[PDB]
Amino acid sequence: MHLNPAEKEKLQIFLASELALKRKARGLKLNYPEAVAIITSFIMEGARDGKTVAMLMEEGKHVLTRDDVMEGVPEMIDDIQAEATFPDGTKLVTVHNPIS
Amino acid sequence: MHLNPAEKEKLQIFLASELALKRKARGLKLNYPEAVAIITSFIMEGARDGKTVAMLMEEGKHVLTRDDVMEGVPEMIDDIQAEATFPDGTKLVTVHNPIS
Amino acid sequence: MHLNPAEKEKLQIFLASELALKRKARGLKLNYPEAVAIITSFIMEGARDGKTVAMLMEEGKHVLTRDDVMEGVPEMIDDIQAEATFPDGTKLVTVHNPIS
Amino acid sequence: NYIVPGEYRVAEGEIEINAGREKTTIRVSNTGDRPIQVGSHIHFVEVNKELLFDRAEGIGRRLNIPSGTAARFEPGEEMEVELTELGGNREVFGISDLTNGSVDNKELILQRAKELGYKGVE
Amino acid sequence: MKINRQQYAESYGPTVGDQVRLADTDLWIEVEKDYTTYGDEANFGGGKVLREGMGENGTYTRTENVLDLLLTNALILDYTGIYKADIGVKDGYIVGIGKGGNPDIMDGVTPNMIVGTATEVIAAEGKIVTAGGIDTHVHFINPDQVDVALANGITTLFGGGTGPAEGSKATTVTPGPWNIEKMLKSTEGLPINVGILGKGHGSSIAPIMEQIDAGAAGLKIHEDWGATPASIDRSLTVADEADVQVAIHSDTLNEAGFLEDTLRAINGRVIHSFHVEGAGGGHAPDIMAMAGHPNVLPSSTNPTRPFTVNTIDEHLDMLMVCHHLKQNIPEDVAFADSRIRPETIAAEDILHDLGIISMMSTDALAMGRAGEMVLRTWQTADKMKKQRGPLAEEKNGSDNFRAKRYVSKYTINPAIAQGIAHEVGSIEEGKFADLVLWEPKFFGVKADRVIKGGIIAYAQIGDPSASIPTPQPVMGRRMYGTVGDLIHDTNITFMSKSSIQQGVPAKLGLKRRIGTVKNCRNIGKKDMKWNDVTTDIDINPETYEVKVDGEVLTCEPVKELPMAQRYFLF
Amino acid sequence: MKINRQQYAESYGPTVGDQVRLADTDLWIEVEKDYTTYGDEANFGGGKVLREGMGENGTYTRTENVLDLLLTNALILDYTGIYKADIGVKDGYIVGIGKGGNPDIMDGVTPNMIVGTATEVIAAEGKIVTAGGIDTHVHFINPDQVDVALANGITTLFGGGTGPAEGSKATTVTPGPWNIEKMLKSTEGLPINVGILGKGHGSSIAPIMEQIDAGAAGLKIHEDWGATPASIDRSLTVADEADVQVAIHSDTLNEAGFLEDTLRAINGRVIHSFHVEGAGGGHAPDIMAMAGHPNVLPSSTNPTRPFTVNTIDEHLDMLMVCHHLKQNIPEDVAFADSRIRPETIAAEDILHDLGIISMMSTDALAMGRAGEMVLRTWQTADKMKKQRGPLAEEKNGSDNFRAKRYVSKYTINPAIAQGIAHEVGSIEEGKFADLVLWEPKFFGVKADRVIKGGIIAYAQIGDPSASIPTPQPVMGRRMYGTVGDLIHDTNITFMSKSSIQQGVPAKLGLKRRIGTVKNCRNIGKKDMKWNDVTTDIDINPETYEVKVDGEVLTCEPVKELPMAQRYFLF
Numbered sequence A, B, C: 001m002h003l004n005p006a007e008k009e010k011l012q013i014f015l016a017s018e019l020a021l022k023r024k025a026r027g028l029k030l031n032y033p034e035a036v037a038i039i040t041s042f043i044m045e046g047a048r049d050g051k052t053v054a055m056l057m058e059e060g061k062h063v064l065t066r067d068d069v070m071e072g073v074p075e076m077i078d079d080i081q082a083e084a085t086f087p088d089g090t091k092l093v094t095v096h097n098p099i100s
Numbered sequence D: 001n002y003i004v005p006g007e008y009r010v011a012e013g014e015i016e017i018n019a020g021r022e023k024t025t026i027r028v029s030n031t032g033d034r035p036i037q038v039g040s041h042i043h044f045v046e047v048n049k050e051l052l053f054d055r056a057e058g059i060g061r062r063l064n065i066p067s068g069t070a071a072r073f074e075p076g077e078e079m080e081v082e083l084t085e086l087g088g089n090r091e092v093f094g095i096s097d098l099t100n101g102s103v104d105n106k107e108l109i110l111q112r113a114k115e116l117g118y119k120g121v122e
Numbered sequence E, F: 001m002k003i004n005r006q007q008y009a010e011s012y013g014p015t016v017g018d019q020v021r022l023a024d025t026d027l028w029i030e031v032e033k034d035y036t037t038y039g040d041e042a043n044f045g046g047g048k049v050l051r052e053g054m055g056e057n058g059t060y061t062r063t064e065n066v067l068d069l070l071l072t073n074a075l076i077l078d079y080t081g082i083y084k085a086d087i088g089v090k091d092g093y094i095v096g097i098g099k100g101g102n103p104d105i106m107d108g109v110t111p112n113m114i115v116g117t118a119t120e121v122i123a124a125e126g127k128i129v130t131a132g133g134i135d136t137h138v139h140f141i142n143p144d145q146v147d148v149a150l151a152n153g154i155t156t157l158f159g160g161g162t163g164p165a166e167g168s169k170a171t172t173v174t175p176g177p178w179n180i181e182k183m184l185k186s187t188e189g190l191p192i193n194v195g196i197l198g199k200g201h202g203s204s205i206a207p208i209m210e211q212i213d214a215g216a217a218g219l220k221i222h223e224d225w226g227a228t229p230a231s232i233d234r235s236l237t238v239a240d241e242a243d244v245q246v247a248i249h250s251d252t253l254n255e256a257g258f259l260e261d262t263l264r265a266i267n268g269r270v271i272h273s274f275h276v277e278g279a280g281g282g283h284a285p286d287i288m289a290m291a292g293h294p295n296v297l298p299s300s301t302n303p304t305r306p307f308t309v310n311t312i313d314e315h316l317d318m319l320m321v322c323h324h325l326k327q328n329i330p331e332d333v334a335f336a337d338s339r340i341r342p343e344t345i346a347a348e349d350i351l352h353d354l355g356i357i358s359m360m361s362t363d364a365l366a367m368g369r370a371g372e373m374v375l376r377t378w379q380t381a382d383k384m385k386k387q388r389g390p391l392a393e394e395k396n397g398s399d400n401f402r403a404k405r406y407v408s409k410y411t412i413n414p415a416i417a418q419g420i421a422h423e424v425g426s427i428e429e430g431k432f433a434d435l436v437l438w439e440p441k442f443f444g445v446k447a448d449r450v451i452k453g454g455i456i457a458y459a460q461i462g463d464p465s466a467s468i469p470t471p472q473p474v475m476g477r478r479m480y481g482t483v484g485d486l487i488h489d490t491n492i493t494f495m496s497k498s499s500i501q502q503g504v505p506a507k508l509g510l511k512r513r514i515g516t517v518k519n520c521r522n523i524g525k526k527d528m529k530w531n532d533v534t535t536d537i538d539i540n541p542e543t544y545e546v547k548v549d550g551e552v553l554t555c556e557p558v559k560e561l562p563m564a565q566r567y568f569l570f
Ligand SMILES: O=S([O-])[O-]
Pocket: E139, E169, E170, E171, E172, E249, E274, E275, E280, E281, E363, E366, E367
């Protein structure tokens, strides 16, 4: 596979997001690291899908809403940042105030 | 996410349990580490769901039965122990003789 | 669980294959590490299922076809090698030219 | 325009190995009952005693085959091979200890070969 | 007051006459003798015996017959016996095997096994304790290989390499003074004992010898560097002068000679014949005949061990991959068919059972599995019991003879071959405290704790954030023996006498314990414990049939092994 | 006997006139010359040429013209040429580029490239071999950055920082004697070459100079510490005395001056202008005009490299995040719009192609990607070929001129700028053996093996438990060169002459090889290999249009790059 260090690390984020999605599916309000994981994996998968940085800045604000998360979580997440390989190479996505 | 060392490690258990559940779903009798993984992840998810330590001590004895596992596995597992964050903080669950 | 070093590492391959399978399911042409991951996990799961080395040498050539992967991927993969625990212990499987 | 990452686009033409060196064809027989495979750069006179050939014709020579390849003799098999000349200083040391110096010392090489039972000293 | 035997074994581990199943094999070991005094067993914990004024002596300073470490109630499995004892460690060495505690109040205390203020305790009741495994065929290719080895109970790696260079990927060789010096330095950071082999190739002495003087512990002759009569001869002349061992991977191609020619070059001198069955390398097809000779110390590598239904398919393809062979160069197909042979692989199982192959080894990362030497030894012994029956020499229905024959293959015999058995390779007084604790359910599969120089180096242990160490995930992890400078005192770098005399450790700044290789040239097959058989092995050049004492040695491949899918996640 | 060229290239790697595609780019490199003697190619393995009495010499001791390491059949890509040769290493240095083997029997053997008993072999047939990358803009923020660098072929990190302190998160600075001493000690454990920059700020000489005497290798002037005329001047006076390089990140805000003021303070003295295009910092909007001047050694950082459809969106937001800017402080919006400019980013692509920007660098973890300097160099070259055509200087349809121009940007040019090209930065005889092997399919993407001081430090290699090293998972892993004390002999700490003369290495107990920085003040643009163009660059203050020789330099952003989604898992 030729995994580099970032590729190994970033598999953890996907895993954490899968964990969190299972938790959400069984009716739990998500916590801080769960919410961060879901939004982060969504950004990275979106890059893989070939979306633009601008599309993901917009979409990342609609992945989870306040009723999906525990009290205070929205206000604990000022932004979520992720780097991924777009069709035009690595770029940084920052989603500002993802959960209103 | 602010993952600490235990949070990183414990993602491995979830993963191993997902692996084992796929193996069970395709009809295999499970082996020692597969069985341990499934029961351990069940305890940790149960804590996340807000069950009590006492509920999980009871339930963990009914997650796998002897017909789910290879010969000798039941007798190889004297107990399964896991720590997880309950609503009232980290607690230790020990499931005694989980598979009869 | 008593995980040894190889067991920990090899969980990563399963995870990468699960990631790649999701990507394929949503319609993407797979890339080099995605393709390697899927074929590798298939070999390891096949060993777990109790297939023979010879069966897996054959089957591994039919897991992905050229229309499943990006341009050039087939020709980048000369072979895929994996070791797993068969019913008769660890063996090496090499799938030669898996994607035509 | 299909892209194979890292592919070669080789030039036209062919590569002549061992150019300019004398070539010699000899017949060689594996008189033993186990297979013998001989690499490109072994001093030919020092190969396995049970290969029968004119030992003198192997002095100062090796197989004229691509570097790193080999010729195979199954038990009882006789075939022809093509040899090329050793280069550099044309000295051989070690291997079977038949030479240990210049390859020009044919009589000495053959004497040692004969005494030790290397087949084909004529 | 009497205790029934079931309850006694549950509390203290088994005693005389009791049997214990090895993992999920059908091998049973029986307690031969027990050093305890019943009622004065040592144990540690709340209200237990090892407490001040009681089983722990409160008077004596450390120097005064007090231990640094007591392993209580161990079931020892060793070439020397299968028996129950306390094991006492001091200054990193085994100082006492017997009965530990306090002579104030206990009967039967071995006089230098006092539990005192200075003493740490490991509870070995219910565990099997063996010597650390000695792997003498290690390619140093990927440092991640060390933990793989430790996890299956290996504590000494002898071999060569510089990492994933092609020379090293093919051969157990660290070539020349500079690469040797560099790898001795690298060794400072590897948490396992090490000895390094130089290149056993050359037609002049000095290029070979300078490797020994640089700090090599031995030499390797490998066909990939030219396993010629000259290189064989020079290497063995060096070894005889230097008192180090030579390993050989002979000329598979029969290019400069057949087996008899290689034996003539050896000229009766001592040599360790690697992968003697030959799938891993050597004169085709008859190399395994080396194992009949009195001057040959023969080992197997592990992928042929034992003969299974996937072995041949796996090896034919592994060989093609390794050597870049093509399925339409008829010479490559013929080569592979001449090298990978069910006839010699099946005979190799039986030769082990008969004590004619004396040693196991890995061939780690070149054609063998770093963490499966111990594993596959026991799988072989189990297959042979099933196919050949309990051996003649057994009694009481136990498999003790076989168990001593097979444990010797990866403990004492490699150590004797290498000239390091004064230091390592068995549980005996005066040897380094390299000890492996096994739960019987995991015996030969996954080690519980690996003690190196008297401090735990590796353990299967759980969540480091937990209230106790047993919660999940329980995985193999490096312990305090590997951390900081303790890595220097818990591990040995084995070196030639001449490099030691010449001050190489100081020149390189080596802080590890320095072990001296010696008494390598004055031994033979007869010195291989439990595996000392010399015989004429005939290998038919047409059919590859192996005969010993006029009888064809053949057995079937098995479809399943113990110590396999019950245990492993992959 | 003749071999067709396809088969010859398959066996030995390509020869004269043969072309090789770089990864999945449309760049082709052509073999210019070949040092071999056809039929006497070196190779290693069973029945191969490097065997005793044959291609390996069995007579000579190590000192006698014998190598420690031979890389066989390498395709070298270097500022010095694109050509085929064996590479010989001894004592950690490149000693021979030519033809290796045995003069006994081979023609054409370079006289100090004898394969002997002492010699290890790496097979480079079919690989591209380059010098290790020299990254001169490293923020030392997170030690996990080192493996990221090694995985993309970087072997030297020059920069500063103390970990994730704000000063370090913004600036390549290790400030003052104590932090310098502490980070030289930390460096003992980093498996890569290092040089440390002090704070290039002050209005008196002594506070600045004391950093050089403490063991800094250079200085960094950064606007976040006040990139004032005084700090510029003092730093360059120190540098001129100490013979070390000064890097600059100028006053973006134009607070104390415009570009011309910074140039006046420099006063013709040598300086390395970091992120010269300016998105990464510098006088708005015209900093890139520095790259026209003869006393400026200009580098780019990597996130602008090359200009893509997501670049501007990404950078405007990255800048807002980094500087805590708010979308409703109109001054913050204006600042960002003045700093992130498509006009200067597109021109930066072309300036690289023209040889007017001489160097690439990362800006690791401050505004740049530790593992993408090499990656993005080649993506830029590929984009420029597509948009501008093969350059004038090409012939035979190859991209050799461009390939030499661009490899120089991350190998030799940074080394010359820093005063370390006597040691590192190119594949030449007498330089340290920092070498990167690449499979052509992965060229510039994921290194195969990274050799540091002649021992492999990092490799893409597989399962450590396997019979061979190629089974999955194949991932980047630290090799034996990084382990134990070998980390000291395989890596260089670059220091000022004065700290070396003053005994700093002994005072701190540094065991690493110590490299001397020198010949930094007597160079200019003309000394940048393949990238020596001086010209008047005009940047329009209203439109940000860049002109050179009266022509607007503009190109389009691309939607896709090679060396991207085919290769990466994320
Ligand atoms: O490395 S193999 O030749 O035992």
